[PDB]
Amino acid sequence: AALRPLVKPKIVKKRTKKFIRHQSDRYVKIKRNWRKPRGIDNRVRRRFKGQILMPNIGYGSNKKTKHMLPSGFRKFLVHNVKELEVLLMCNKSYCAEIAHNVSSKNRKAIVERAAQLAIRVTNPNARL
Amino acid sequence: GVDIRHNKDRKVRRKEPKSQDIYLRLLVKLYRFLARRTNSTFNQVVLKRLFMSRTNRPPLSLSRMIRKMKLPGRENKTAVVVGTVTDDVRVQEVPKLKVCALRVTSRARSRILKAGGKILTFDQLALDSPKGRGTVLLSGPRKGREVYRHFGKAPGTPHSHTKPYVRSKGRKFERARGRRASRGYKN
Amino acid sequence: ACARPLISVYSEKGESSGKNVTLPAVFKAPIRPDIVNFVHTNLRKNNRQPYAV
Amino acid sequence: SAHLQWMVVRNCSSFLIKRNKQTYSTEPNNLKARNSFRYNGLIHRKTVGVEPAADGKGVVVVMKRRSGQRKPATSYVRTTINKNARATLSSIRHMIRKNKYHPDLRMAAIRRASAILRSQKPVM
Amino acid sequence: PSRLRKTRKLRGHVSHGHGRIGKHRKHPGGRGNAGGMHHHRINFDKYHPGYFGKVGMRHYHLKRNQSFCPTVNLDKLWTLVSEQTRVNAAKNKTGAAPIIDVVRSGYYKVLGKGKLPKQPVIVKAKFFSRRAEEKIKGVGGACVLVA
Amino acid sequence: NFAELKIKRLRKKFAQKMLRKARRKLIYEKAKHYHKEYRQMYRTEIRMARMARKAGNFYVPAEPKLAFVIRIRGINGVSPKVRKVLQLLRLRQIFNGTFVKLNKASINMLRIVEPYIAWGYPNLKSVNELIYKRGYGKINKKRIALTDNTLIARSLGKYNIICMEDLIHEIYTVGKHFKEANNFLWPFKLSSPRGGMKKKTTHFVEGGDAGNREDQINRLIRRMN
Amino acid sequence: APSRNGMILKPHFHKDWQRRVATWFNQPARKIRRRKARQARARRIAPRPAAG
RNA sequence: AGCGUCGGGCCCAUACCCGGCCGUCGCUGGCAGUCGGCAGAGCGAGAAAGAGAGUGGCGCGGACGCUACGCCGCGACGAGUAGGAGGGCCGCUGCGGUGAGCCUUGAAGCCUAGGGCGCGGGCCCGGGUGGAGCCGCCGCAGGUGCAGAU
RNA sequence: GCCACGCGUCCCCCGCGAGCGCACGGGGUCGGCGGCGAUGUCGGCUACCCACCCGACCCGUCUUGA
RNA sequence: GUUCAAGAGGGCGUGAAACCGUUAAGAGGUAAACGGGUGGGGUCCGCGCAGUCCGCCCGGAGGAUUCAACCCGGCGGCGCG
Ligand SMILES: [Mg+2]
Ligand SMILES: [Mg+2]
Ligand SMILES: [Mg+2]
Ligand SMILES: [Mg+2]
Ligand SMILES: [Mg+2]
Ligand SMILES: [Mg+2]
Ligand SMILES: [Mg+2]
Ligand SMILES: [Mg+2]
Ligand SMILES: [Mg+2]
Ligand SMILES: [Mg+2]
Ligand SMILES: [Mg+2]
Ligand SMILES: [Mg+2]
Ligand SMILES: [Mg+2]
Ligand SMILES: [Mg+2]
Ligand SMILES: [Mg+2]
Ligand SMILES: [Mg+2]
Ligand SMILES: [Mg+2]
Ligand SMILES: [Mg+2]
Ligand SMILES: [Mg+2]
Ligand SMILES: [Mg+2]
Ligand SMILES: [Mg+2]
Ligand SMILES: [Mg+2]
Ligand SMILES: [Mg+2]
Secondary structure (H helix, E strand, C coil): CCCCCCCCCCCCCCCCCCCCCCCCCCCCCCCCCCCCCCCCCCCHHHCCCCCCCCCCHHHCCCHHHCCCCCCCCEEEEECCHHHHHHHCCCCCCEEEEECCCCCHHHHHHHHHHHHHHCCCECCCCCCC | CCCCCCCCCCCCCCCCCCCCCHHHHHHHHHHHHHHHHCCCCHHHHHHHHHCCCCCCCCCEEHHHHHHHHHCCCCCCCEEECCCCEECCCCCCCCCCCEEECCCECHHHHHHHHHHCCEEECHHHHHHHCCCCCCEEECCCCHHHCHHHHHCCCCCCCCCCCCCCCCCCCCCCCCCCCCCCCCCCCCC | CCCCCEEEEECCCCCEEEEEEECCCHHHCCCCHHHHHHHHHHHHHHCCCCCCC | CHHHHHHHHCCCCCCEEEECCEEEECCCCCCCCCCCCCCCCCCCCCCEEEEECCCCCCEEEEEECCCCCCCHHHCEEEEECCCCHHHHHHHHHHHHHCCCCCHHHHHHHHHHHHHHHHHHCCCC | CHHHCCHHHHCCCCCCCCCCCCCCCCCCCCCCCCCCCCCCHHHHHHHCCCCCCCCCCCCCCCCCCCCCCCEECHHHCHHHCCHHHHHHHHHCCCCCCCECCCHHHCCCEECCCCCCCCCCCECCECEECHHHHHHHHHHCCCCCECC | CCCHHHHHHHHHHHHHHHHHHHHHHHHHHHHHHHHHHHHHHHHHHHHHHHHHHHHCCCCCCCCCCEEEEEECCCCCCCCHHHHHHHHHCCCCCCCEEEEEECCHHHHHHHHHCHHHEEECCCCHHHHHHHHHHHCEEEECCEEEECCCCHHHHHHHHHHCCCCHHHHHHHHHCCCCCHHHHHHHECCEECCCCCCCCCCCCCECCCCCCEEECCCCHHHHHHHHC | CCCCCCCCCCCCCCCCCCCCCCCCCCHHHHHHHHHHHHHHHHHHCCCCCCCC
16 A cells, blocks of 8 residues: 555656766766856857757746656655654645654654654664 | 747745744734735735835834825824834924824824824734725935935036035035136036 | 733742732834834944044 | 734744745635635634544544634633534534534534544544 | 945956946056046046146145134024023013123124014124124124123 | 515525516627628628619729738848837738728828738638637737627727627728727737748749738638638 | 046156055054053152143 | 640648747736624726715524635746846755654665656666665855866 | 517517426546466566667867867 | 685776776768657566555444542642732
C-alpha cells in the first residue's frame, strides 16, 4: 500500500536536459554551472543555428505541478519530531523528508510516530 | 509581427504605499473596500491621496481653512484634509469648526476646542458619513516649497525669474559680467 | 484609549493582596515597529570600537 | 487590538517556520497550522483548540472564556471527551454550533478530531 | 547598505557602467573649475552669470555686530504677550493700552507689514518705519522711542 | 412571511420571460422582411437592363458604395507616409482585413498605397462568412467573441441595432451608422491563402495581385478563409 | 567637469590633510578625569566654596 | 536537365491561422457575504433607480475558501549591444533575537556511472571517507561571487 | 402556406395552468474491453559508453568590418 | 607486534584538481570536441514482480453490563431579567 496522493496528474516536463555552459567540454577550469556570456562577437548570445540554447522564461512549468515528485507529494525538510504534527493535517499531499545530520536512534522514533500518523516518509531505511 | 511601440504601456502611478506603518495600511484596507463597493468618486480621491509622499500631502494652514469655510453655502460642513493642520499665529479670531485630519498639533487643537469645535478621525468619519456628504475637500499648496523658484527657464536667459544656486549672496558673488549693462552685457 | 482598568497586586509569596492599582496611560499608547527597529539599529552602532589597518 | 497585532506578528514571529517554498506555524491552538489571520489562535476573544489528551488516550477540547484576556491562568478551559467517534462528533458539533461560537472553524476541528482518534487507535 | 547599492548587480557586466568607447578615464575634461573662461564658458553663462568681474567698494575691517538689526513685523507683534493681556484690555472700559518692550525680546526695528486689530497699544521701540507708525495712529496709541 | 414575496418574485420572472419572447418574435420579423428586400434589389437591376436593350440604349449601373481591403505584405521597411495611412485603416498585421466606405477621400489614400493592398467590391455571401465565422467585437477595449445578441444590445441599442442581421443590413446598405458599426468590429484576422498567390509584387493587370481586382476578391476570400 | 547645475564651490582638500586628523575617542575618559579631579579638589578644600 | 511564351499540380521558413503552456502589462477588474431554529442561501441583465415601512378601502443538519504585501477572472503583447531600473526561498563572512534546533549511536570539509527539485543562480536526500563542532528563520554591517590583465 | 385563433370594450372600412421526455445546445466521457508476470523479467527522463542522420569555423577585445 | 585507528611510522591530521600507472568496459581510416532527435548496451535503484482503499448502504454471522429520556453535581456560553 503505497501512500496515494490526492491527485496523480500528468507531469509533463518541457525540457529535461541541463543547460551546460559554452566550452565546459573543452576545459576543466570551466564548470557546468550556467553563466550568460556578455561578449560582442559571441555566437551563442545571438542564436546561431545548431548552437547551445539559452534559457528563456518560456520553459516555465505548469503551476499545478511545480516542485512535484512523481508520486505526487511535495517535500518538507525535517529535523525532529515536533515538526511532524504540523503535517498531520496536511497529510495526503505532503511528506516529511529527514535531514542528513539527524541520527539513527532518533530516526527510529521519527518513523514510528510518522507511521502512526500515516505520513509517508521518503527515507525510512537510511542507516541500519 | 505588429508595428506598435511598447514604450509607454507601463503606467507609473502608485498602487500601494511604500510605508510599512500599520495605521496607514489599515486606512487603506478600509477605503479599498468602500472604493470598490460604492459609486462615490470621493473615496477614490481620498485613496489616491493616501498613497502620496510628504511633499504631495502638504500642511494646511488654519487661516486658509477658515476662510474657505467662510465662503457662502458651505456652512456647518466638515472640512477634509489629508495633510497636517498647523496653527496660525497671525490670526486672532477663531470661529468654531468641524475638522478632520491625520495629525493636528496641540496648539491648533487647543485653539479649536476652547472655541467649541470638534476633531474627527477617519474611523469616526466612516461611521458618520460613509459616502461623505456635507464635506469640503481641501489641500495645501504643492508649489509652496522654496525649490520651485529654482526651476524653469534658466538664469542668464531673457526673462527667467529663477533663483540660482549660490553659496552666499553679497556684492561680489554673481553680480557682474552677465547682469550689469556696463560690464559686458545683460540680458 | 480612554479606558483605564484596575490591576490587582500580588504578594511576593504569590497570593493576591487586597490592594488594586490603576493602569497608567502609556500602556495604551501606539505601537510602531518601524521606529523601534530604526532606533535600535542606530543606537546600537555607537557602542563600537574602531578597527583599521 | 487584534488586526493590529496581526499585522505585527504575521512576519516576525518565532513560531513561524518557512521553508521549501512553504510556510507553516506551530502554535498550540492552530488547526491547519497555516499563517493566517483567520486561524491564528492567540489573537481572538473566542478561540478553539482540539488536542489529544494529556494521557495518551483521549481528546480534550479547549475553549477560551471571554472575561479575563490579560489573565492567562483563568482564560482557557480544557475538557476531555473519552467516548466513541460518532458521539464525539455529535457533541462537538453541538458545542460549537448552538452557541454561535466560532462557526468558521467547524469543519477543520472535526477533521482534526477524527485524525487524532485515528492515531490513538492502533497503527496499520 | 552596500547590498542595496548598484555595484552588486553590475558584477559581471564588463565595463561596470562607464561605457566602452569612452572609458572611465581619469580626468577627461581637465580638473576642477577649469576652462571657465574658455571651453566651459557656457555652463557658467547659462547657470552662473556673474562669476567673473569686480564690483563695488572695498570695506576692510568689517564687524557684523555693529549692524545687528533684526526686524519684526506688526503681523506678529501681539505674539509677544500672553492672551489675558489682550483679553483684559477689551474688558478695560477705561481704554489703557499695555506697553510692549520689544528690545527685551531681542528685536529692534518695527516694520509695518500686516493688519492690526482694533485695540490701542504703546510700543517702546528703537526705530520705526513710516508705514508702521501711521497704522498705529489710526488704531490708537503712540510710538514711544528708546535708544 | 416569504409567501407574498415568493409569489411576487414569480411574477417578476414571468414578466421577464414574456419580454424575452417578445424580443425574439421581433427579431424574426425583421429578418424575413430583409429577405424580401434583398430579392427585390437583385431582380430590378436586371429588369433595367432588359428594358434598356429593348429600347437600344445602355444601362450604366451605380458606382459601388463599399470596398473590402486586404494588406498583403509585411512590416519591414515601409515608407512613413504609408505607415501613417496604414495604421489609420487599422491594418497592423499582415493578412488583416477591413471594410471601408467609399468616397474621394478614402480612394485617394488607397491609391497612395496601391502596391501593398488588394481591394474590391465584395459580395453578400462573403460578408456573411466573414461576420459569422470570425466576428469579434471591441467591448471595453477587449476582443470578445460575437456569440450572443446581448453583447450587441448593451452597446448599440441606441441605434436599434440588436442583432447580426441588422449589422449586415447596415454594411451592405451603407446606412447612417457605419462609423459605429465598423469601429465596433475588430480588424479581421484572416489566414494565409489556400491554393497560393500568383505573384505578390506586381499589379493585377501586369499579372499580379495588388490593386483593384473588383470582383475576384471573392475568389480570393474563399481561398483564404 | 560640471554637468548642468550645482553650487560652485572651493573645497580645501589639496594640502596633505589625511596626516593631521584629530580623533575624539578620548572624550568620555576625559570627562571622567575632569570629574574626578573636581571631586578631589572639593574634598581637599572642604568648607570653602567649590566654585571659587 | 538549354532559350522564349504559358497551364494545371506540387515542395518549406522561427512569417500567417486554430489549440495547449510560462511571464508581464492593461481592465487603477471582482472577493470582508463563512449575514445559519434572531436561517431561507439570488442582484450577468439591452434600456436612471427599492427582494423598502405602514395605513384608509417528528428528525437539530448545510464541502472548499480570505498569508488581502493574499486568492481569483478577463483581453492584448514577449529580438535586443553600449545604458538604466525592479525582484531574487541566488550564493559568501561575521553581530542581536529566536528554534526546550542537530551532533562521538560520529560535525565541518571531501569523493561519487545513485535518486530528485528549480526557467536559472543553486539546493535537498542515499552511499563511501573523515574525527568536533554546525545550521534554519527575522533584522544589521561588509576587505562579499574570476578565465582572460605579455 | 402563415411564428394567424377567448369574451367585452378601444381604432379605419366591410402580470402566478400545470406535467413529462429529446438534444448538432454556456471546453470528454464510457454505467466498454484484452495480454502479461517471483529468478529472469518490467519500469528507470537525467547521469555512463558506443553507433547513426542532420545541424556546426576558438574564445576575450578594439573595430564601419573578426 | 603497539594503539579504537598506523586507512597517522619522525617535513608523520584531513589529503581535491592538473599529471601518471595498472585494472575493468566500450570503440576506432576523413584530428579531436559539440547541439537536437532516437536506438543499443552497461550501471545501479525501484527492497516492483498477481496489485486502490475510503465513507455510506444492503445482507448474513459474533460480542459487551451499552442507547435515549429524567434526577443530582460542577462548568462554560447568552440574556429584548
Ligand atoms: Mg572577436
Ligand atoms: Mg513580437
Ligand atoms: Mg547589458
Ligand atoms: Mg575596456
Ligand atoms: Mg571619473
Ligand atoms: Mg568624455
Ligand atoms: Mg496543397
Ligand atoms: Mg545633477
Ligand atoms: Mg574642575
Ligand atoms: Mg517552425
Ligand atoms: Mg493564438
Ligand atoms: Mg525591444
Ligand atoms: Mg526582451
Ligand atoms: Mg579519519
Ligand atoms: Mg580530528
Ligand atoms: Mg583561476
Ligand atoms: Mg581587444
Ligand atoms: Mg564593430
Ligand atoms: Mg581599420
Ligand atoms: Mg611537502
Ligand atoms: Mg597525511
Ligand atoms: Mg571533477
Ligand atoms: Mg582491457
